[PDB]
Design a protein around this ligand. Structure first.
Ligand SMILES: CC(C)CCC[C@@H](C)[C@H]1CC[C@H]2[C@@H]3CC=C4C[C@@H](O)CC[C@]4(C)[C@H]3CC[C@]12C
Ligand SMILES: CC(C)CCC[C@@H](C)[C@H]1CC[C@H]2[C@@H]3CC=C4C[C@@H](O)CC[C@]4(C)[C@H]3CC[C@]12C
Ligand SMILES: CC(C)CCC[C@@H](C)[C@H]1CC[C@H]2[C@@H]3CC=C4C[C@@H](O)CC[C@]4(C)[C@H]3CC[C@]12C
Ligand SMILES: CC(C)CCC[C@@H](C)[C@H]1CC[C@H]2[C@@H]3CC=C4C[C@@H](O)CC[C@]4(C)[C@H]3CC[C@]12C
Ligand SMILES: CCCCCCCC/C=C/CCCCCCCC(=O)OC[C@H](O)CO
Ligand SMILES: CCCCCCCC/C=C\CCCCCCCC(=O)OC[C@@H](O)CO
Ligand SMILES: CCCCCCCC/C=C\CCCCCCCC(=O)OC[C@@H](O)CO
Ligand SMILES: CCCCCCCC/C=C\CCCCCCCC(=O)OC[C@H](O)CO
Ligand SMILES: CCCCCCCC/C=C\CCCCCCCC(=O)OC[C@H](O)CO
Ligand SMILES: CCCCCCCC/C=C\CCCCCCCC(=O)OC[C@H](O)CO
Ligand SMILES: CN1CCN(CCNc2nc(N)n3nc(-c4ccco4)nc3n2)CC1
Ligand SMILES: CCCCCCCC/C=C/CCCCCCCC(=O)O
Ligand SMILES: CCCCCCCC/C=C\CCCCCCCC(=O)O
Ligand SMILES: CCCCCCCC/C=C\CCCCCCCC(=O)O
Ligand SMILES: CCCCCCCC/C=C\CCCCCCCC(=O)O
Ligand SMILES: CCCCCCCC/C=C\CCCCCCCC(=O)O
Ligand SMILES: CCCCCCCC/C=C\CCCCCCCC(=O)O
Ligand SMILES: CCCCCCCC/C=C\CCCCCCCC(=O)O
Ligand SMILES: CCCCCCCC/C=C\CCCCCCCC(=O)O
Ligand SMILES: CCCCCCCC/C=C\CCCCCCCC(=O)O
Ligand SMILES: CCCCCCCC/C=C\CCCCCCCC(=O)O
Ligand SMILES: CCCCCCCC/C=C\CCCCCCCC(=O)O
Ligand SMILES: CCCCCCCC/C=C\CCCCCCCC(=O)O
Ligand SMILES: CCCCCCCC/C=C\CCCCCCCC(=O)O
Ligand SMILES: CCCCCCCC/C=C\CCCCCCCC(=O)O
Ligand SMILES: CCCCCCCC/C=C\CCCCCCCC(=O)O
Ligand code: NA
Length: 387
């Protein structure tokens, strides 16, 4: 039995290293949003709330985790707060991650009414509510769902704890049925699965809208060939009627003028077609190629460019949520083994603290994702560092 302070010194040193990196990186995130007006959107307000939770992981949760690893004597409910405050920060992260996913879905599903629905004032109120809910969820053991009424008195006596005190150890005070059923299943796993469902809807809507743009572009060019290879005025009319409906469908200053010309030129050729003037209608329909090459094609490429940027932004948000799941799932899975398999030997000490360190590492990764995937963050990061 090697001296416990040796393994403890390694765990504590790693925790402190994580705390420094979590504070430095996420302070840089909040500083960037504060300085850059181009970063001051509703999505990044939840990014700031998420960064604030990770700053608090380094300032409070990691010092709390170091303290509870010692098993020091404490009043049980005070021990509960040390043990459960990190659950508040994790729950706040979940609410921020879910809000970001919903915000990205609203922006791609109904972009016409996004600015009227998703505002900064409403976002700040949602953030405040979610922080209150995170305290209620994370500190639910302090409301009575704890093991303080049944303290391990032999462990407390062996450590010389005073009357009314317990050896402050996580699994001694926090019930595992709370950790598995309430915290993990209901409050972590279900919202993460909801996020997965939201992101599936986002990318499916992106693929559908990109296909609709390509369908309107092909229908525009196909019916142009139909008019050229037509023989009577009726065939020209059928092709022009489908072009006009598709032109107004794709329409949903330089953008409006381009479609004003297109629909007007379609109406010109339609009127000639209704008069039986096939040659004159085809010549008028050939003028549509000038409007297509000078206006319509530019709108197709810009609308495609906008959707691809929304896909890129939605993937950046999905990576953050996936990394949260990857960093926290091992610790939750270990709790499931402890809870559901009492015949299984408890996960060893080194693995417990590896899972704890890994969960804390998640408070370091998000500033790197923003730097590698978001040019506006990366450029603002460089300006802050150089200055
Ligand atoms: C605003 C921020 C910075 C203040 C941080 C306050 C923290 C550090 C305080 C608030 C409540 C405190 C706990 C309250 C009760 C107990 C029980 C006692 O038997 C041992 C200490 C212990 C476990 C305290 C540890 C420190 C503690 C968690
Ligand atoms: C900004 C908001 C969250 C205010 C933060 C204040 C919180 C962290 C402080 C304020 C008063 C504190 C409590 C004061 C007294 C006790 C009784 C003790 O037996 C256990 C700890 C406990 C329960 C403290 C836990 C932490 C506490 C709840
Ligand atoms: C989310 C991704 C990273 C998958 C994580 C898988 C990890 C958390 C899984 C894979 C294998 C698992 C271990 C397999 C077997 C045992 C022996 C048992 O007596 C206690 C639990 C313990 C020690 C498990 C703990 C959790 C474990 C380490
Ligand atoms: C929903 C998916 C994507 C991720 C969550 C998977 C979790 C809930 C699953 C994956 C592996 C599972 C464990 C695998 C094996 C055992 C050993 C058995 O004696 C009791 C249950 C227990 C401990 C399972 C509990 C639930 C578990 C931890
Ligand atoms: C002992 C424990 C004490 C610790 C106490 C923890 C309290 C939780 C703090 C949350 C800060 C929230 C971060 C602020 C993010 C809000 C984003 C924002 O400011 O948006 C502005 C608005 O949207 C424009 O109109
Ligand atoms: C830097 C701050 C140092 C904090 C010092 C924390 C003391 C760790 C400790 O005593 O562990 C007790 C048992 O877990 C076995 O060692
Ligand atoms: C700066 C913001 C605050 C950060 C503070 C971090 C310190 C972590 C909490 C440290 C908790 C102190 C542990 C304690 O009280 O031990 C003595 C008992 O055994 C007496 O019975
Ligand atoms: C407490 C932890 C740090 C919380 C950091 C507080 C958040 C800083 C505010 C911020 O950076 O955002 C400004 C806002 O976007 C303007 O519209
Ligand atoms: C800015 C905030 C400063 C906080 C520093 C945390 C330091 C925590 C100090 C904990 C000392 C506990 C102690 O000395 O306990 C001894 C034992 O309980 C009886 O001999
Ligand atoms: C989302 C997935 C949920 C599945 C989680 C269910 C895991 C719980 C199964 C463990 C269990 O039921 O164990 C029974 C007990 O071991 C008998 O002795
Ligand atoms: C005998 N063993 C010695 C080592 N002990 C380690 C106690 N620390 C600990 N233990 C657990 N189970 N969790 N779960 C969590 C968590 C937080 C969020 C989701 O999960 N944190 C934890 N911290 C366990 C007993
Ligand atoms: C731990 C489970 C918590 C369940 C509690 C349910 C109530 C929470 C509801 C929150 C929605 C908040 C919207 C209303 C805000 C109005 C504030 C006001 O009166 O000005
Ligand atoms: C992440 C990078 C590697 C992580 C290494 C640090 C984590 C665990 C090694 C510690 C060995 C034993 C832990 C003892 C914990 C304790 O005494 O309370
Ligand atoms: C990083 C600073 C190094 C601190 C090492 C931890 C030793 C404290 C201890 O275990 O008692
Ligand atoms: C994770 C680490 C990123 C740290 C980048 C260093 C710059 C810090 C500047 C600051 O604290 O505002
Ligand atoms: C530890 C907690 C530190 C949190 C770091 C958050 C920093 C980011 C934004 C806070 C607002 C900045 C206030 C100073 C403004 C000065 C100026 O405008 O030039
Ligand atoms: C910027 C402010 C950040 C706060 C710095 C906090 C750093 C201290 C870290 C851990 C404190 C651990 C206290 C140890 C518990 C007592 C051990 C015992 O009594 O057996
Ligand atoms: C503010 C920055 C933190 C200041 C000082 C860190 C010193 C932590 C001392 C912990 C003592 C542990 C013990 O005595 O058992
Ligand atoms: C449930 C907990 C309730 C907390 C009250 C927080 C105040 C937020 C009101 C603003 C809501 C909003 O603008 O959408
Ligand atoms: C962030 C805004 C604050 C919202 C807080 C809402 C949830 C509060 C939950 C638990 C606080 C319980 C404090 C415990 C009292 C002392 C217990 C005791 O002495 O035995
Ligand atoms: C919907 C979110 C609202 C926030 C939570 C509601 C307020 C909770 C009220 C009181 C909590 C009191 C803390 C309990 C003290 C000691 C209880 C115990 O011995 O376990
Ligand atoms: C997503 C929902 C996640 C988990 C569903 C929970 C079902 C667990 C049943 C518990 C089995 C038992 O009581 O032994
Ligand atoms: C619980 C399983 C993990 C769920 C994480 C969902 C976050 C986004 C992931 C993928 C989007 C495609
Ligand atoms: C490398 C990081 C950890 C890798 C794999 C986790 C599996 C460890 C399982 C060891 C068995 C524990 C036991 O003996 O009860
Ligand atoms: C990101 C996934 C994390 C896995 C990376 C593995 C790195 C750390 C692994 C092991 C260090 C902990 C000590 C392992 C051997 C200890 C055996 C023992 O003390 O009984
Ligand atoms: C012990 C501290 C581990 C730090 C976690 C690493 C997070 C991001 C890593 C590399 C980005 C380049
Ligand atoms: Na987090």
């Amino acid at each position: 039995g090697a001296p416990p302070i040796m393994g403890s010194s390694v765990y504590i040193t790693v925790e402190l290293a994580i705390a420094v990196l979590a504070i430095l990186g996420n302070v840089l995130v909040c500083w960037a949003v504060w300085l850059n007006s181009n970063l001051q959107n509703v999505t990044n307000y939840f990014v700031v709330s998420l960064a604030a939770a990770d700053i608090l992981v380094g300032v409070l949760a990691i010092p709390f985790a170091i303290t509870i690893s010692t098993g020091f004597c404490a009043a049980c409910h005070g021990c509960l707060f040390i043990a459960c405050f990190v659950l508040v920060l994790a729950q706040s992260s979940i609410f921020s991650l879910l809000a970001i996913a919903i915000d990205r879905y609203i922006a791609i599903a109904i972009p016409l009414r996004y600015n009227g629905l998703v505002t900064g004032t409403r976002a700040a109120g949602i953030i405040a509510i979610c922080w209150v809910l995170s305290f209620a969820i994370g500190l639910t053991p302090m409301l009575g769902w704890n093991n303080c009424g049944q303290p391990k008195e032999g462990k407390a006596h062996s450590q010389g704890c005073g009357e009314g005190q317990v050896a402050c150890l996580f699994e001694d005070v926090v019930p595992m049925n709370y950790m598995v059923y309430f915290n993990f299943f209901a409050c972590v796993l279900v919202p993460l699965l909801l996020m997965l469902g939201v992101y599936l809807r986002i990318f499916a809507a992106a693929r559908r809208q990109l296909a609709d743009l390509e369908d309107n572009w092909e229908t525009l060019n196909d019916n142009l060939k139909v008019i050229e290879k037509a023989d009577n005025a009726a065939q020209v009319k059928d092709a022009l009627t489908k072009m006009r409906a598709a032109a107004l469908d794709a329409q949903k200053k330089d953008f409006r003028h381009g479609f004003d010309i297109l629909v007007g030129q379609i109406d010109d050729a339609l009127k000639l077609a209704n008069e039986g003037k096939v040659k004159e209608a085809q010549a008028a329909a050939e003028q549509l190629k000038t409007t297509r090459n000078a206006y319509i094609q530019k709108y197709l490429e810009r609308a495609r460019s906008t959707l691809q940027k929304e896909v890129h932004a939605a993937k950046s948000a999905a990576i953050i949520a996936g990394l949260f799941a990857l960093c926290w799932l091992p610790l939750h899975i270990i709790n499931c083994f402890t809870f559901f398999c009492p015949d299984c030997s408890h996960a060893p000490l080194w693995l417990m603290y590896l899972a704890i360190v890994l969960a804390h590492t998640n408070s370091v990764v998000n500033p790197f994702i923003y730097a590698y995937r978001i040019r506006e963050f990366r450029q603002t990061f460089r300006k802050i560092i150089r200055s």
